[PDB]
């Protein structure tokens, strides 16, 4: 529980807790007409919101400013899908309200082939009851992944990811000494989270056949 490691963890939590879900989205989830079209508009707003907060959180990550400019974009794009589903898993696990959200998701023009593993995945996440701190570090670990396509200097990214692993690995030992494999179980969930890169490309195919409109931010972050 180093000084420098405690300084880092406060920096990450300062940035993670600025990220909030506007009331206007929440209110739409609860008040708006319930149709496939309207459920899909709501999901589009949520996703647009997720990406804005992702960008905010990312730009404040220690060392992020000092990375090559193109590499910065590569990590944002490269991470968006995994980061969104991880935020989405936290958020889901609001009072119910979550039920109503779940039904909007199940009725928004998405085949169960993609709906199924999403909810399955949320349950996997829920079974570890992770802390705020763990969600935040996992999130930064995903964003700062040196394996994404197009990165020119993977070593630079690797430097920034390592200290966050160390912190995370320590927290796991402190808040889960009874299970010494907790860390490994968390890295386990990143494996499951990577599979959504493929799922989301597929579902984005389905949706564009139907000719659904995306926002500029969604179009740009996902190369639509």
């Amino acid at each position: 529980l180093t000084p420098d490691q405690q300084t880092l963890l406060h920096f990450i939590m300062d940035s993670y807790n600025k990220q909030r879900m506007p009331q206007e989205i929440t209110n739409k989830i609860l008040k708006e007409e319930f149709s496939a079209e309207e459920n899909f508009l709501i999901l589009t707003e949520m996703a647009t919101n997720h990406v804005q907060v992702l960008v905010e959180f990312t730009k404040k990550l220690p060392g992020f400013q000092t990375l090559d400019h193109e590499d910065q974009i590569a990590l944002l794009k490269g991470s968006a899908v995994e980061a969104m589903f991880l935020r989405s898993a936290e958020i889901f696990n609001p009072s119910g309200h979550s039920d109503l959200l779940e039904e909007r998701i199940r009725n928004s023009g998405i085949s169960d082939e993609y709906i199924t593993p999403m909810f399955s995945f949320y349950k996997s996440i829920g079974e570890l009851k992770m802390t705020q701190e763990e969600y935040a570090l996992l999130t930064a670990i995903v964003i700062l992944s040196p394996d994404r396509q197009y990165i020119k200097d993977r070593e630079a990214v690797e430097k920034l990811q390592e200290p966050l692993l160390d912190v995370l690995q320590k927290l796991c030992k402190i808040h889960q000494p009874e299970n010494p494999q907790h860390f490994a179980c968390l890295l386990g969930r990143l494996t499951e989270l990577r599979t959504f890169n493929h799922h989301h490309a597929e579902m984005l195919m389905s949706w564009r056949v139907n000719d659904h409109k995306f926002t500029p931010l969604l179009c740009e972050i996902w190369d639509v």
């Binding site: 960008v55 730009k59 193109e70 974009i73 944002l76 931010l217 740009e220």
Partner: peptide
Amino acid sequence: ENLLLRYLLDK
């Protein structure tokens, strides 16, 4: 580039 994203990173 990806200009909307660069704008958002530079605020």
